[PDB]
Amino acid sequence: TSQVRQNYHQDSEAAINRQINLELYASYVYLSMSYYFDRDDVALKNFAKYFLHQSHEEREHAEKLMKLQNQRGGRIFLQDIKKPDCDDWESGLNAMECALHLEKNVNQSLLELHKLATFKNDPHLCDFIETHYLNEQVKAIKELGDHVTNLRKMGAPESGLAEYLFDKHTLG
Amino acid sequence: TSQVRQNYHQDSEAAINRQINLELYASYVYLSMSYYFDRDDVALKNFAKYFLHQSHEEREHAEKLMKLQNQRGGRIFLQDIKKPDCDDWESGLNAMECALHLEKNVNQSLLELHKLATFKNDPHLCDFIETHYLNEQVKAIKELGDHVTNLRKMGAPESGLAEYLFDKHTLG
Amino acid sequence: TSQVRQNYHQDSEAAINRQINLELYASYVYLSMSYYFDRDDVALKNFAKYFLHQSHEEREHAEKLMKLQNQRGGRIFLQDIKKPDCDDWESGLNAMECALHLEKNVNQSLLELHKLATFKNDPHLCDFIETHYLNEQVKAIKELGDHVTNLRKMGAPESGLAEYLFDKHTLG
Amino acid sequence: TSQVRQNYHQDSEAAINRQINLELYASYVYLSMSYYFDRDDVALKNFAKYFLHQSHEEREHAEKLMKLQNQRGGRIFLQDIKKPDCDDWESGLNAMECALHLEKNVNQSLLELHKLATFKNDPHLCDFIETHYLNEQVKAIKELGDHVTNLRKMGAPESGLAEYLFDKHTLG
Ligand SMILES: [Fe+3]
Ligand SMILES: [Fe+3]
Ligand SMILES: [Fe+3]
Ligand SMILES: [Fe+3]
Ligand SMILES: [Fe+3]
Ligand SMILES: [Fe+3]
Ligand SMILES: [Fe+3]
Ligand SMILES: [Fe+3]
Ligand SMILES: [Fe+3]
């Protein structure tokens, strides 16, 4: 037992480890999506910067959970990081949509995790989730919903002009 | 009676009080429109900022009349600020059309306030309107006209691409 | 149903919309209170500047709730903004006492909007309330508590001298 | 007849010349009032600085009318500047009440000089009055109204303490 540990239940330790892997997973989805738009037959340079920025942000989230695990006396346990479901992401509107489906599963995971932290009476783990992850997911999800909408209204994906002008008037 | 009152007819005092409610009403409409474009199925961020600017200007027109009422020795008498007509504004073109209708209705009320003040041989009240309101209405009305014309000519509302480009390139 | 809505109960949607009305009503009371100390027969410049600031900060309180509704996928429905209880607030001490009542009123709504968010297991909404409204009302209520206490111990409202000196020294 | 005179009635010529006298008389009252608070047995430094400013701004009010007469082709005819009603204005509150009377007096003349310019269809003279004298008197009369109200609610003139504190805090 760790000398710094206090009020940190074993089940939150495991649920922090699991959230670490999901956050790494998401960073790797975003990496995958980013270099898809770097492709010379997709070629939406700001879609690329976007998802690459998100990718780095998501690994930033994973490192913040690993720091916390150590602050609370928990022990990190890492697992394989599954390859993304896709190798090709089809179009910009399509890519925005999987990102939105992705942040809503990261969100469901945090929400279930905050729920556990409430049952196990850990207010420090609860504020940690609240400050650094909860509004962040709410913002992310609102952002991606805005993008999907403008893309649909412009004419994407059957219009390449739509994804071209969006690629630069919104993500530039 | 007020120690400062002078050539300030009670009809004026009442019409100023009504004008204050009209400006507050307008401000409330513009607030409702502003946040209609904030929402995730609309996502026209500069329409939302345009109208939030108009909401704050109208609120500031109201407060100016309240200063004047107290300036001339009248007494402020606030009414309920009634709920705007629409909760959903359909589109950017349509929001712009309602805004035109509104500033033109505010102008007509503002013009009636002026006919009154002439009838009452109140010259200070006349110059107050001339300086701080009449040209404002003429300018506001002209601007929304321009905006209507351009939106129709770009193919709105049936073009989703028109409102989006109009958002980037006229309101940003 | 909205593409960003996740874990955002119908009940909470309605409660926010209501808190929006309330924050708008409070901005109006303060507006009404503000221009009463501008009267030539009351003449408290700093009391007036005080409530105009409070009024404007209550408007921002409402716009922030309007933003949140759209972030969470909820749907703004506005309401008549009913006129404030008074058109004549008697004295600076009476006016401050009304605000103390008014702010404890809004505290009430928020605490119940929070219990409701506890009931519906919405931690994001909860910390949103925790971070942006709760300590503000605790501060706002303590600020007015101090003001009311000072005016009483000075001789207000019988001493008009008390209110003149408060106006320059605590609000200048 | 003057080479620049155009649409400038004999009647208006005479009315301006009269308003010139009046503005000069008001500068003299204020002058007289000013050096009464300099007395070693009254001793209100800021009351004194107050009326000396008002006196000087009334002189500029007269010189501006002198300028206008020559712009319009009219012909200045000056008059005795009669001595002010008092040589002893009793107290700061009484002095402020006299100014409120005096400024409502000049408001009177201007409003009638304006009706006259309406009667003679002289829009230039009208807007000249609108722009440079009307809102100044509305401001001047509201300023003194506030001052009178504050001194009364403080205890003036019975409390010499009231007038000492007004002198530093509203006029310093
Ligand atoms: Fe992200
Ligand atoms: Fe994340
Ligand atoms: Fe307006
Ligand atoms: Fe406007
Ligand atoms: Fe407040
Ligand atoms: Fe509030
Ligand atoms: Fe003092
Ligand atoms: Fe003056
Ligand atoms: Fe003058």
Looking at the complex, does the CB of residue C38 fall below 8 Å from at least one CB of chain B?
yes
User: What is the torsion angle, in degrees rounded to the nearest 10, for the CA atoms of residue C106, residue C109, residue C113 and residue C118?
Assistant: 100
- Nearest CB partner across the interface for A149, out of B40, B161, B168: B40
Looking at the complex, does the CB of residue B60 fall below 8 Å from at least one CB of chain D?
no
Identity of residue D103: E
Looking at the complex, does the CB of residue C39 fall below 8 Å from at least one CB of chain B?
yes
Residue C90 CA, ligand 4 centroid: distance in Å: 35
Looking at the complex, does the CB of residue C80 fall below 8 Å from at least one CB of chain B?
yes
d(CA B87, CA B28) in angstroms, rounded, equals 12
Q: Do B3 and D108 touch (CB under 8 A)?
A: no
Q: In terms of CA atoms, which chain C residue is nearest residue A107? A: C6
Tokens representing D107 are 């408001």
Tokens representing A102 are 């992705």
Name the H helices within chain A: 10-37, 45-71, 92-119, 123-129, 135-154, 160-169
Q: Do B39 and C75 touch (CB under 8 A)?
A: yes
Specify the 3-state DSSP secondary structure of A78: coil
Identity of residue B153: K
User: What are the φ/ψ torsions at residue D82 (nearest 5 degrees)?
Assistant: -65, 150
Question: Which of B5, B120, B124 best probes binding to D when mutated, by most D CB atoms within 10 angstroms?
Answer: B124
d(CA A136, CA A147) in angstroms, rounded, equals 17
Q: In terms of CA atoms, which chain D residue is nearest residue C169? A: D169
The DSSP code sequence of B43-94 is --HHHHHHHHHHHHHHHHHHHHHHHHHHHHT-------B---S-S---SHHH
d(CA C26, CA C58) in angstroms, rounded, equals 7
User: Taking Cα atoms as reference points, which of B22, B12, B9 lies closest to residue B78?
Assistant: B22
Identity of residue A118: T
Residues of C with Cβ-Cβ distance to B83 under 8 angstroms: 78-80
C-alpha distances (whole Å) from D25 to each of A1, D20, D62, D76, D85 are: 95, 9, 10, 16, 10
The residue length of chain A stands at: 172
User: What are the φ/ψ torsions at residue A58 (nearest 5 degrees)?
Assistant: -75, -35
Name the CA radius of gyration of chain D, rounded.
Answer: 18
d(CA D17, CA D21) in angstroms, rounded, equals 7
Tokens representing A77 are 């346990």
d(CA A18, CA A109) in angstroms, rounded, equals 9
C-alpha distances (whole Å) from A38 to each of A93, A144, C31 are: 16, 20, 55
Angle at D41 between CA D36 and CA D42, to 5 degrees: 50
Residue A54 CA, ligand 2 centroid: distance in Å: 9
Chains in contact with A, where contact requires at least 3 CB pairs less than 8 Å apart: B, C
d(CA C106, CA C144) in angstroms, rounded, equals 14
Cβ contacts of residue C98 below 8 Å, gap of 6+? C29, C33, C85, C86, C89
Q: Do D135 and B124 touch (CB under 8 A)?
A: yes
Question: Which of B21, B81, B89 best probes binding to C when mutated, by most C CB atoms within 10 angstroms?
Answer: B81
d(CA A125, CA A118) in angstroms, rounded, equals 9
User: What are the φ/ψ torsions at residue C67 (nearest 5 degrees)?
Assistant: -60, -50
d(CA D115, CA B10) in angstroms, rounded, equals 20
Tokens representing B63 are 């407060």
Q: Do D142 and B71 touch (CB under 8 A)?
A: yes
- Nearest CB partner across the interface for B168, out of A146, A152, A169: A169
CA distance D134 to chain B (A): 6
Written in H, E and C, the secondary structure of chain D is CCCCCCCCCHHHHHHHHHHHHHHHHHHHHHHHHHHHCCCCCCCCHHHHHHHHHHHHHHHHHHHHHHHHHHHHCCCCCCCCCCCCCCCCCCCHHHHHHHHHHHHHHHHHHHHHHHHHHHHCCCHHHHHHHHHHHHHHHHHHHHHHHHHHHHHHHHCCCCCHHHHHHHHHHCCC
Question: Which of B4, B66, B71 best probes binding to D when mutated, by most D CB atoms within 10 angstroms?
Answer: B4
Residue C137 annotated in ligand binding = yes
Q: What is the resolution of this structure in A?
A: 2.9
User: Taking Cα atoms as reference points, which of D27, D154, D166, D160 lies closest to residue D90?
Assistant: D160
Interface of C with D in 103-162 (CB under 8 A): 160-161
d(CA A69, CA A67) in angstroms, rounded, equals 6
d(CA D103, CA D22) in angstroms, rounded, equals 11
Quick one: angle between helices B45-72 and C10-36, nearest 10?
30
**Method by which this entry was solved:** X-ray
Specify the 3-state DSSP secondary structure of C37: coil
CA B66 to the chain's CA centroid: 16
Q: Do B160 and A154 touch (CB under 8 A)?
A: yes
Cβ contacts of residue D59 below 8 Å, gap of 6+? D23, D24, D27
Q: In terms of CA atoms, which chain C residue is nearest residue A139? A: C71
Q: Tell me the β-bridge partners of B81.
A: C81
User: What are the φ/ψ torsions at residue C160 (nearest 5 degrees)?
Assistant: -60, -25
